Design a protein around this motif. Structure first.
Motif, PDB file in Angstrom:
ATOM      1  N   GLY A 186       0.821  -1.194   0.000  1.00 24.21           N
ATOM      2  CA  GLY A 186       0.000   0.000   0.000  1.00 24.21           C
ATOM      3  C   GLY A 186       0.862   1.253   0.000  1.00 24.21           C
ATOM      4  O   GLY A 186       2.041   1.202   0.342  1.00 24.21           O
ATOM      5  N   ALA A 187       0.255   2.367  -0.408  1.00 23.42           N
ATOM      6  CA  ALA A 187       0.920   3.656  -0.399  1.00 23.42           C
ATOM      7  C   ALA A 187      -0.145   4.746  -0.390  1.00 23.42           C
ATOM      8  O   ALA A 187      -1.148   4.626  -1.086  1.00 23.42           O
ATOM      9  CB  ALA A 187       1.819   3.775  -1.603  1.00 23.42           C
ATOM     10  N   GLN A 188       0.075   5.784   0.420  1.00 28.08           N
ATOM     11  CA  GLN A 188      -0.782   6.957   0.413  1.00 28.08           C
ATOM     12  C   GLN A 188       0.064   8.204   0.647  1.00 28.08           C
ATOM     13  O   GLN A 188       1.117   8.142   1.277  1.00 28.08           O
ATOM     14  CB  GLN A 188      -1.895   6.832   1.454  1.00 28.08           C
ATOM     15  CG  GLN A 188      -1.405   6.432   2.838  1.00 28.08           C
ATOM     16  CD  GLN A 188      -2.454   6.623   3.908  1.00 28.08           C
ATOM     17  OE1 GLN A 188      -2.178   7.171   4.974  1.00 28.08           O
ATOM     18  NE2 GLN A 188      -3.663   6.146   3.646  1.00 28.08           N
ATOM     19  N   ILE A 224       4.097   8.095  -3.454  1.00 27.91           N
ATOM     20  CA  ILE A 224       3.505   6.939  -4.107  1.00 27.91           C
ATOM     21  C   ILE A 224       4.523   6.348  -5.084  1.00 27.91           C
ATOM     22  O   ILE A 224       4.653   5.127  -5.173  1.00 27.91           O
ATOM     23  CB  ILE A 224       2.170   7.311  -4.783  1.00 27.91           C
ATOM     24  CG1 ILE A 224       1.129   7.736  -3.740  1.00 27.91           C
ATOM     25  CG2 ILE A 224       1.660   6.163  -5.644  1.00 27.91           C
ATOM     26  CD1 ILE A 224      -0.164   8.247  -4.327  1.00 27.91           C
TER      27      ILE A 224
END
Ligand SMILES: O=C1[C@H](Cc2cnc[nH]2)N2C(=O)CCN(C(=O)NCc3ccccc3)[C@H]2CN1Cc1cccc2ccccc12
Ligand SMILES: O=C1[C@H](Cc2cnc[nH]2)N2C(=O)CCN(C(=O)NCc3ccccc3)[C@H]2CN1Cc1cccc2ccccc12
Ligand SMILES: O=C1[C@H](Cc2cnc[nH]2)N2C(=O)CCN(C(=O)NCc3ccccc3)[C@H]2CN1Cc1cccc2ccccc12
Ligand SMILES: O=C1[C@H](Cc2cnc[nH]2)N2C(=O)CCN(C(=O)NCc3ccccc3)[C@H]2CN1Cc1cccc2ccccc12
Ligand SMILES: O=C1[C@H](Cc2cnc[nH]2)N2C(=O)CCN(C(=O)NCc3ccccc3)[C@H]2CN1Cc1cccc2ccccc12
Ligand SMILES: O=C1[C@H](Cc2cnc[nH]2)N2C(=O)CCN(C(=O)NCc3ccccc3)[C@H]2CN1Cc1cccc2ccccc12
Ligand SMILES: O=C1[C@H](Cc2cnc[nH]2)N2C(=O)CCN(C(=O)NCc3ccccc3)[C@H]2CN1Cc1cccc2ccccc12
Ligand SMILES: O=C1[C@H](Cc2cnc[nH]2)N2C(=O)CCN(C(=O)NCc3ccccc3)[C@H]2CN1Cc1cccc2ccccc12
Ligand SMILES: O=C1[C@H](Cc2cnc[nH]2)N2C(=O)CCN(C(=O)NCc3ccccc3)[C@H]2CN1Cc1cccc2ccccc12
Ligand SMILES: O=C1[C@H](Cc2cnc[nH]2)N2C(=O)CCN(C(=O)NCc3ccccc3)[C@H]2CN1Cc1cccc2ccccc12
Ligand SMILES: [Mg+2]
Ligand SMILES: [Mg+2]
Ligand SMILES: [Mg+2]
Ligand SMILES: [Mg+2]
Ligand SMILES: [Mg+2]
Ligand SMILES: [Mg+2]
Ligand SMILES: [Mg+2]
Ligand SMILES: [Mg+2]
Ligand SMILES: [Mg+2]
Lengths: 179, 182, 181, 187, 182, 186, 180, 180, 183
Positions: G116-118, G124
């Motif tokens: 995941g990435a935010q 990102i």
């Protein structure tokens, strides 16, 4: 936690400390206690600090860091799995020539994280504090790695992932530990 | 909200007579409404006074500056009248009224303090946020100085902590021009 | 967590080392008071070593520890490692004269007491008078322990005040920065 | 929302004033797009006035507004009051050349787009490529609108960058800072 | 809310210069009542206004918004306690035009000292304490003026919750008459 | 959290203190805490009916009935029970401080002692509220009478001085008669 | 956990058997690494038996185990029982050559890494590059361990890929199906 | 609420009928007080009709309604339909003498007031005294309205006391059971 | 955190060695099971020596309480009861259940008696069954309390209609205990 001593207690008998979690005050207190105990048992023999850690509290990190530098025995550092943030700081803090990573271990460096809420003056104080803390971390990393403060600043602006070989070239470790 | 009869809710009826009610926390919605009212009233009559009632604990500084700038921009004098409480950005807007036409009723409370905020994330993000709120405070203090006749140095000291003023004290300070007697 | 031959903390206690390594609440204070009294009974003459890595906590729990330190016969050395903030820094400064230490990268923070009150005006008044008296008590002891004037302590604790080990020494909160052995 | 004998916002729309006074989402965009098209139909020659007090929001919603502005014949003036951040500052810069304004104490902030991605590596890759393309698209248009280089926009939007009204003018995000006699008709 | 012909019942009462304070006093309620009072003054500066009070009280600053508006406007504001007037509610009951403060026979009046809160640093607590203590002094002084009781008696009698019958409220000076049936 | 000691037997620190006739009341008073302290008092009396017992008090108070379980056991047993306030004694905590053997009630210099009236609650029918009110009022009369006997202050004064939260320094607690002595360093 | 007079797991460790029977996280990795070290110290020549019943988990934690296996002198036999998925199957393939096993009804699943990435676009980008590199690393080692091409591994791990014990053998993830 | 060519409730109010068909709180009391005063102003001689289907509620809100009923010139008829409980049954009894009704299967319940208190002993005392004085007030007025003694009302309201319409009539809470 | 005495006992186990049982909590099935087990064990150790049951309890489950009551009456040894702090509801019932002449309270201990509490939801028939059940239970409690106190069932019914708080001295006059234990 299997028994033989629980497995960690057994390793400690052979002067092996396992930092295998997020660094908080509890973890720091335990590792400080283990370091002081091992010094007391034998002030000459090497200690081995295994590091698989995503980092955590900077002050707790510095509790471990200062204790390492205080005691007489060399503390070898061995990165296994991951050393991130304060974890990579502690990896770099091992005895000169005795900092290691295994070939597939990952090393990550980044600037410290924090928070501040309240009045403008309070935010200012908190901001000045984390900035001074970063300067402190960068200065020591510079001394430990041979890289300039300017380079450390730039390279930690965002998350910086390194291979074991890249960590060695960076000066965070001395050697990739071969089979 | 009561209706009066041409059927108006009470607030709309007051607006017909050029009275604007700032009676809540200042947010973007409140600011958009008050800005809309000011611009409407200028169009209706560019010369006649407008009356801005203030009973507000303050709120968003940027939302407050939306109102501030619109007051200064339009041709009509905007009278300000503190009733109940004017705190933080609320007291800033009280002080923003046309010179000579800033009022509080006798038992109204005026409170001044430094801006509040928050920041989490990386050291550099904290730095940016800190520099932003400090610049924001300097901006507020400079205008307060111009509006009150107090030095910036005095404003800084007097806003370090919550500073509660009576109507009469607000007048002495230069935040208002007169206490409105019965 | 780990065991030797004792849990690690119990092993250190055998060598008269007490670990204050958490937020200070009544449970922590009760434990440290008990350890201090035990150590005095075991040996009334040998020094005790109080490690401090603490963000502070309850003032009354802090004073439980403070009063026990001063009560017992043995000198209690204080050693700041990691962080000593608030009541933690107070206890750091409360160590035996000449035996208050911090490691070089340890952090020391001083500020004013925190609290809360809700209810009637008279209740708020009582609460306010209480915390103000508590602050005066704290500031007077810090003055006595550091050699700084009460007036300076008041000014320097108005907001969060972070000190390096060396600054804490210059201030008089500690006697010495402990250099590598 | 007070009434005028029209709710206040509808009364302003009568005089060709559109209020963008919130976070930009699809609802807000649909409303503003409809108002723009309506105003064009009423009169294709007279200017429109877009008020902007907005922290930004959805990039696609923002581009719905952006494209509609550029499609219609009337000039759309933009005026920043309070704050124009992120997509809000983008729309501020998208007003008719020479007719982009901010009031003196208004705040303008520019930064890079925010987003998220979870799942498989290939899904993360697709999401990353998508937001990186979106940023290139935003930056290219900002460059055209401000007269600043893409290289400068990239550097200046890496982190939150707060500008005063005057700074926004020198940056080319706006054309002019809107600056503010005796009579006996006050009452 | 039933309709009469087209008025909702409350708007119909406002047409006859009757304002209903029938809830907890917050800024919204204060803003409404202030608006009504000013409107009624503008409609007729000489005819009495009737303020119905069935309220447990609420915000002191909100209460003072109402209080100051009552004293400011030209028309007499009659106050009529029906059900309950507690805290700031009883303060406003007492603030009605001299001779025109009423309660119905089984109405309840309660007086007590102001409530509040404070958290943070000792200095912040001190500021909050000084503020609520000054607010209480202000409340007590006005109550003294309005009731004919000494400040010292008001202080004692509001130390804790003090429930009065309509007759007791009359004897205390919070109201002028118990309104007996027609 | 609780370290072990080993002498020439292995003890947790609290058990080691109990071996030397020290009981720790270091928490809010509830039925469980009272049960433990009562049991300890009984045990220590049985071990030696003449040697002093030491009751450490660092407590914000708590249940009045649980407090009276401790109180009555102190008075019942033969050994003197010394009380020593360290940190804080509030409410029922300060009541038990005042309950120690005459001449052997202590506080360390920076210990905080607080006295106030009992707290409680009641909901339901008017008659149920009446029962609860009469109960807590009678309970306060009981507390105050004993406090009067223990301090030498009049009931009238105790009533007045406990109307609201009343924070005393150790020295003030001595002049009040809640303790006998402020304990000086050894 | 039953006791033998040792708890059952400790008893198995006495005979050089290590049980990976959970999700792989840092705590599990730490325990298994420690057991591997200990058993080497006890005897550097005798084989170690690693039981694998795991749905996988942290890639870095798995590489702690992976690298420790390759570092120590003793051969580490791997035996899949129940399930070996994701990092679990990676570690199954990491056993000593000729000594990687599964029991007949054991399930083996391979797939690409999850994450995941935010935040900002650039954040990102960094996260994306990281997990992509991690996948290259995993695939390269799998290629070396199985004898399959990197190109084939990439295709076969694009989505969840469930294999029988027999299929795992012919893929090269194990050497032998342990038959009753 | 259906519409008539008015919402149904507003249409009923046109014929001087007020609906108390909910729990009694300040909002309900304010509305009913307003309606009563409006109807008096429309016509000070014609009867008003208060429908009661209510479980009761706030005593002070109840007294707002009660005092307004007694204050105005018009007779206020009360008609219990469904249920009148607690303060609901108090208001039922408050109707004009001779014009208090219940329909045959309507349920009337009387009981002592409910409340609460927490805090210091002296605060509990103040709250206890308060609710006890309120009950004395309620009972005195009930006695006046029903013809029953204060002593009897005290006993009969000690716990929940459910009455049929006919029982409510013999009790004096109503004058008549309204027959088809 | 229960302290240890050293032959290593927790404090409660140490008291049980001297035939003291501590009921210092709400009465539920777990508490009853433990106390019953303790009573049985002590009888087995010595069938003649007294047992001491300390009571500081707000009460609880009636059936759990009856498990204790019945075990007390079943075993040979006299079980003394000593109320310390508070004995409420089923707690006061067990206080009254001690061996005649050996029921005690310390001077400031509180005794409260009241009627049993419960609940029921569902069909009218189910509510009826629940009501009849709790009414029967109260008759059972009251009859035994009458036998134990020497008070009439009629008086017990009246005196337990609502929470009835007694001093130690009042509990003695009521017949719930035999003696107030003096220092
Ligand atoms: O670099 C070394 C060397 C390497 C060595 C030489 N012979 C065996 N191992 N070393 C020593 O020279 C003495 C202490 N020691 C023992 O294994 N001691 C034996 C033992 C006894 C009981 C339990 C565990 C280990 C090891 C510890 N480390 C560091 C180390 C730490 C943590 C995890 C690791 C994982 C992989 C490689 C290294 C690791
Ligand atoms: O200042 C000191 C000095 C420093 C010293 C001198 N010689 C060795 N160490 N000291 C003593 O003079 C006697 C007790 N002691 C032992 O190490 N005793 C040996 C021992 C035996 C068994 C377990 C642990 C330690 C130490 C404790 N401290 C305080 C202290 C506490 C906690 C963590 C610390 C980390 C870094 C520095 C200090 C620390
Ligand atoms: O810059 C302009 C210009 C110039 C102008 C005139 N007075 C102030 N500024 N303008 C026009 O030339 C025609 C439309 N219009 C009216 O006011 N029209 C009259 C009117 C009628 C009815 C309701 C409102 C306004 C304005 C709208 N705007 C943009 C604008 C939008 C929103 C909020 C603002 C707040 C402050 C300044 C500008 C604002
Ligand atoms: O006032 C006293 C006196 C004071 C004394 C005289 N000589 C040493 N201390 N006292 C005794 O006279 C016998 C029991 N005892 C021991 O220390 N006994 C030795 C011991 C052995 C093993 C563990 C702990 C203590 C002490 C306990 N207390 C009470 C007490 C309780 C709890 C925490 C305290 C902290 C600070 C002061 C007092 C404290
Ligand atoms: O493509 C078209 C065409 C072509 C056209 C574009 N601009 C003017 N005309 N079209 C018609 O040929 C008849 C209907 N119409 C009107 O504008 N009619 C005038 C009108 C009157 C009253 C209210 C709104 C619009 C438009 C609608 N659309 C589709 C459309 C929908 C929604 C938002 C849009 C935004 C941008 C472009 C298109 C949009
Ligand atoms: O200070 C003033 C002056 C002076 C004045 C005259 N009568 C009372 N005050 N003023 C005007 O000169 C024209 C507009 N106006 C009307 O009342 N206009 C009449 C009207 C018509 C219809 C509805 C409401 C009011 C007022 C408004 N204000 C500001 C104001 C705002 C809000 C609430 C207030 C409460 C108390 C005092 C002031 C208030
Ligand atoms: O009434 C008695 C009498 C009174 C007695 C005689 N000598 C001391 N006390 N009694 C016995 O006759 C034998 C058993 N016993 C011991 O204490 N035995 C000694 C002992 C040994 C080990 C641990 C604790 C106590 C006591 C128990 N009880 C009942 C009892 C129970 C629970 C809590 C109480 C609290 C206060 C008073 C009584 C209590
Ligand atoms: O007892 C009466 C009598 C009985 C009557 C005589 N003719 C018709 N009804 N009464 C009047 O004498 C005048 C007013 N009124 C109307 O029906 N008026 C007509 C009407 C017009 C519009 C809407 C509703 C009703 C009725 C109201 N009530 C009281 C009442 C209140 C509420 C609900 C009830 C339900 C059942 C019985 C009574 C009810
Ligand atoms: O004391 C008064 C006086 C005296 C009066 C006359 N009849 C009863 N009391 N008063 C006036 O002198 C003019 C205005 N008015 C009307 O009723 N006006 C008629 C009317 C018309 C239209 C709608 C409602 C009322 C009343 C209002 N009040 C205050 C009041 C407020 C609210 C609810 C109350 C309930 C009970 C008693 C008083 C109430
Ligand atoms: O009915 C019996 C009989 C009869 C009996 C009861 N009391 C004295 N005699 N019995 C035996 O004949 C052998 C085993 N035993 C012992 O008590 N043995 C002694 C013993 C030693 C050590 C610990 C506990 C008990 C009892 C168990 N039970 C069943 C039983 C089970 C559980 C709880 C009970 C509570 C009350 C009554 C019965 C209970
Ligand atoms: Mg070293
Ligand atoms: Mg103007
Ligand atoms: Mg000392
Ligand atoms: Mg255009
Ligand atoms: Mg007036
Ligand atoms: Mg004694
Ligand atoms: Mg191997
Ligand atoms: Mg009438
Ligand atoms: Mg028996």
């Amino acid at each position: 936690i299997p028994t033989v001593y629980d497995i960690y207690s057994r390793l400690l008998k052979d002067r092996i400390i396992m930092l295998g979690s997020q660094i908080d005050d509890n973890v720091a207190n335990s590792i400080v206690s283990q370091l002081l105990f091992l010094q007391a048992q034998d002030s000459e023999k090497d200690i081995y600090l295994y590091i698989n850690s995503p980092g955590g509290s900077v002050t707790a990190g510095f509790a471990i860091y200062d204790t390492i530098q205080h005691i007489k025995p060399d503390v070898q550092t061995i990165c296994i799995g991951m050393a991130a943030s304060m974890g990579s700081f502690l990896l770099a803090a091992g005895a000169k020539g005795k900092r290691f990573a295994l070939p597939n271990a990952e090393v990550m460096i980044h600037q410290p994280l924090g928070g501040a809420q309240g009045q403008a003056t309070e935010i200012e104080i908190a901001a000045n504090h984390i900035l001074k803390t970063r300067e402190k971390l960068n200065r020591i990393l510079s001394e430990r790695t041979g890289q300039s403060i300017e380079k450390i600043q730039k390279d930690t602006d965002r998350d910086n992932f390194l291979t074991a070989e890249e960590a060695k070239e960076y000066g965070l470790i001395d050697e990739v530990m071969v089979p």
